[PDB]
Amino acid sequence: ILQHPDGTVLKQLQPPPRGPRELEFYNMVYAADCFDGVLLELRKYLPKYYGIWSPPTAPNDLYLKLEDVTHKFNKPCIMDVKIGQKSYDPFASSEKIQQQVSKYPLMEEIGFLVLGMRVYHVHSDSYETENQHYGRSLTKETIKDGVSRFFHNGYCLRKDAVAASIQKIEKILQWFENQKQLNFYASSLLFVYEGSGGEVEVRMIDFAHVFPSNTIDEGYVYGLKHLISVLRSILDN
Numbered sequence: 668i669l670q671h672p673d674g675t676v677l678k679q680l681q682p683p684p685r686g687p688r689e690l691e692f693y694n695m696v697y698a699a700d701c702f703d704g705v706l707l708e709l710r711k712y713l714p715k716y717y718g719i720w721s722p723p724t725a726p727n728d729l730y731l732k733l734e735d736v737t738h739k740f741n742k743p744c745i746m747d748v749k750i751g752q753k754s755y756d757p758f759a760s761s762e763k764i765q766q767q768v769s770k771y772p773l774m775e776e777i778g779f780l781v782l783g784m785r786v787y788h789v790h791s792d793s794y795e796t797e798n799q800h801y802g803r804s805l806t807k808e809t810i811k812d813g814v815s816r817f818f819h820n821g822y823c824l825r826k827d828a829v830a831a832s833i834q835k836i837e838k839i840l841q842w843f844e845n846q847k848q849l850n851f852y853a854s855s856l857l858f859v860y861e862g863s864g865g866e867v868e869v870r871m872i873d874f875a876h877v878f879p880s881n882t883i884d885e886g887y888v889y890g891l892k893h894l895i896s897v898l899r900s901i902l903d904n
């Protein structure tokens with residue numbers, strides 16, 4: 668992810684088949700002649716899409732030009748949460764499934780995984796960062812506190828941002844409960860709140876494993892429901 672001062676990010680296509688798949692996902696969703704109500708509604712929850720981009724002198728080098736969801740914030744606190752019970756897709760080999768489940772074997776049970784967070788701390792004028800090992804360390808016993816950490820500015824728990832996050836996740840959940848045409852594997856929610864009131868972003872990102880489907884995305888729904896439940900309990904802290 669490359670942050671451009673113009674309020675966009677450039678995401679380099681991942682190697683095939685992942686990068687091509689994410690390009691086609693955005694292309695399908697933001698298709699100029701799309702009148703599909705499901706896809707039109709979904710746009711609200713994605714980064715705005717500015718199409719494929721490549722450097723003027725390097726047509727080989729493929730990027731997606733996307734809205735920087737953090738741009739409107741002064742001191743954005745950012746958390747990326749992978750959603751779902753399975754982070755492998757319907758066409759994964761046995762080896763690939765094993766690889767994916769071993770990365771975080773609690774995915775089925777919890778239905779989400781914190782990929783990272785960056786939290787602004789007021790009293791130190793500084794950022795705490797947590798990497799992928801943080802979330803992969805969390806268990807059923809420690810997931811609530813693990814998530815809570817995102818909402819601590821070093822003096823209060825930001826229950827405003829927690830409540831706002833629930834409210835925005837609920838809208839995404841409502842979208843999922845009103846579509847049976849896409850299933851999303853190893854995709855994420857990006858949470859952003861203002862670390863310097865109740866202003867928040869929650870957006871869907873990372874679409875290298877989105878597939879056509881005939882069914883509700885039950886794993887994604889489970890993940891959202893559990894994440895909402897965890898956030899709800901944090902409101903009682």
Ligand SMILES: c1ccc(Oc2ccc(-c3onc4ccc(-c5nnn[nH]5)cc34)cc2)cc1
Nearest residue numbers: 714733734735736737745746783784785872873
């Ligand atoms: C943990 C916490 C925060 C971190 O920093 C940032 C900063 C900005 C973004 C960020 O802001 N708008 C985005 C649109 C699409 C994506 C994206 N799409 N696919 N993979 N990433 C990331 C975006 C994402 C992450 C990095 C790690």
